[PDB]
Amino acid sequence: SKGEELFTGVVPILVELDGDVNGHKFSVSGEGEGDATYGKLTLKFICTTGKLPVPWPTLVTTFVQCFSRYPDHMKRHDFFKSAMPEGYVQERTIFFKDDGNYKTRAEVKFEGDTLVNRIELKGIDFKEDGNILGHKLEYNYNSHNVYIMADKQKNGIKVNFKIRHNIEDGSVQLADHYQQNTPIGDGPVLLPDNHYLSTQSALSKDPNEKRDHMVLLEFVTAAGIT
């Protein structure tokens, strides 16, 4: 694979997002690094416009699956790395159960030796007193399975999964994710057999950071094929 070789070592990552949720406009800049050999991501995000109007956990999935660890026997199913360096467009609709939805469009590609994720996010129909605008979500994150299938019609993939956000009262706020990825370049990509990604994430704070921010440590491994 052409793109596979670009991930054998530690790669710097930049994430830039502009969002608008129910009229609340904000921007976030993130920096870190990824080491696909171990399916590892380490990043720090800062809301550059002031206070983030939604809970940080709700943006984790929007903030580079090319850093997932694909076992050697599954390398032929790694669409994400195969689209590099030209990259791919990643689009999602995230439905927050009994609340609003986010629609995102992102471009993930290399700029020099840096992997960049540029995102535009639009959120609508959120309840002012719901778990999102009411900031009722715990500052933590669960482990999930991300299901991937080929989309030959677009020379890309379709992805679906359910994120579980813990609510402060002990309940759970479901966020159903529907996703599509299509290559930016015209080169060939790896269309995969059905499989999934096993994820885990830990959220923390930089004790010396006074700006609204999130520190993220994440591990992801592809599975479902033996």
Q: What is the resolution of this structure in A?
A: 1.5
58: helix, coil or strand? helix
Contacts of 170 (CB under 8 A, 6+ apart): none
- How far apart CA 43 and CA 214 sit, in angstroms, is 8
Angle at 87 between CA 56 and CA 4, to 5 degrees: 100
CATH number, position 213? 2.40.155.10
- How far apart CA 90 and CA 106 sit, in angstroms, is 5
Number of domains in the chain: 1
Report how this structure was experimentally obtained. Answer: X-ray
183: helix, coil or strand? strand
What is the H or E stretch that residue 103 is in?
Answer: strand 101-111
Contacts of 171 (CB under 8 A, 6+ apart): none
24: containing domain: 1-226
